């Protein structure tokens, strides 16, 4: 039943005002447990649409209202299929789905 939200952004850095509302937005994301996969492209792991539907609201609430920002929901099974054409996958537990974890 697990699900994965994917967020992609292209946000203007032209002005002081422009950047502020950027940094706020990246922090928001960090604080919400989002993983950075590529520069300007972050993944949030979820567990249910109800978790998803919630996390949606949170984003609407902290919408920077600048740039291009885009949200795509898929499944862990689908996200798992994603192919690395070069470079390696992130080992971070954050990115895993293991219910158990071992720091060693």
């Amino acid at each position: 039943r697990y699900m994965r939200l994917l967020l992609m952004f292209d946000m203007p850095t032209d002005t002081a005002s422009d950047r502020k509302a950027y940094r706020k937005f990246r922090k928001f994301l960090i604080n919400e447990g989002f993983i950075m996969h590529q520069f300007s492209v972050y993944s949030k792991i979820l567990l249910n649409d109800t978790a998803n539907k919630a996390m949606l609201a949170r984003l609407k609430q902290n919408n920077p209202q600048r740039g291009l920002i885009t949200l795509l929901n898929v499944t862990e099974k689908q996200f798992s299929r994603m192919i690395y054409l070069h470079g390696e996958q992130d080992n971070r537990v954050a990115n895993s789905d293991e219910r158990i974890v071992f720091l060693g």
């Binding site: 537990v93 974890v101 071992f102």
Partner: protein, 288 residues
């Protein structure tokens, strides 16, 4: 809710940042959002952690467990204030009648023995299972003729042989003990969050120990532990340990729903307390 069971056994420093638990080992490093976490086990004695972390670990419902030099649970964190309105639910707990306490406690112990027989039936002891259901049938409030005890004896003598005790210090008892501790901790947590004292058990107030009420509540769930450990009865203790963690990984038929375990115990505990406050009749049932 929170789903992860995070286990630490490496010389390391734990910290907090931006809603994330922060794990530093020498080479390796990890961050993990707290919302995701359900349990923190600290296995080893080479671990450092911050007070802030603990605060935030408490702020979320996270069960923290602490361990001996020999990697055995010696303790848990016990928050005071499990709700906005801790006080409200405490006064009701105190208003709990002696009689109700009995009915409810005895209902639970019934479940304990039902599950004990079902486990026996599962290992092909068609007759001892049945023999236990008899003991069940023939009891009264606060099990005055200790039928809980008589079932339990034939339970452990049938499973692990007529010369096994349950008092003897072996890899089996260690296994169940570890297992049992785990379950108690869950209910300890869910109780507090519900707004209760754990010290004030249904049969025994805090005469001998401070987790009496949780010990009373967990009784029907022990056979879960017993299954795992039996299935690994001849494995060395550390193997038994890892196998127990299953309890969190898995799901169980609780209420026409296949549910995860901590989520079960949440609803289970709540609906029990509701009866003891007399907000409802019926009692939750749990069947393996």
């Amino acid at each position: 809710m929170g789903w992860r069971t995070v286990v630490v056994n490496k010389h390391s420093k734990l910290s907090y940042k931006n809603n994330h638990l922060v794990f530093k080992a020498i080479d390796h490093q990890e961050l993990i959002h707290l919302s995701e976490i359900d349990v923190l086990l600290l296995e080893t004695t080479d671990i450092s952690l911050t007070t802030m972390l603990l605060k935030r670990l408490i702020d979320e419902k996270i069960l923290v467990l602490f361990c001996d030099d020999k990697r055995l649970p010696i303790g848990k964190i016990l928050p005071f204030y499990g709700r906005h309105d801790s006080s409200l639910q405490l006064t009701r707990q105190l208003a709990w009648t002696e009689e109700r306490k009995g009915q409810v406690w005895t209902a639970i112990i019934a479940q304990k023995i039902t599950n004990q027989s079902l486990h026996l039936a599962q290992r092909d002891y068609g007759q001892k299972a049945a023999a236990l259901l008899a003991m069940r049938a023939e009891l009264r409030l606060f099990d005055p003729a200790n039928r809980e005890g008589h079932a339990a004896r034939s339970y452990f003598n049938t499973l692990f042989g007529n010369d096994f005790t349950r008092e003897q210090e072996n890899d089996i008892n260690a296994g169940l003990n570890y297992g049992y501790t785990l379950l108690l901790s869950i209910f300890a947590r869910e109780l507090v969050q519900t707004g209760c004292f754990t010290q004030l058990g249904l049969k025994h107030a805090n005469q001998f120990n401070d987790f009496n009420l949780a010990s009373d509540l967990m009784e029907p769930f022990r056979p879960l532990v017993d299954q795992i450990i039996y299935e690994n009865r001849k494995e060395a203790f550390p193997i038994m340990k890892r196998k127990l963690f299953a309890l969190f990984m898995n799901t169980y038929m609780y209420k026409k729903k296949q549910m995860f375990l901590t989520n079960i115990a949440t609803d289970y505990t709540k609906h029990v307390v509701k009866v003891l406050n007399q907000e409802e009749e019926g009692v939750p049932e749990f069947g393996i």
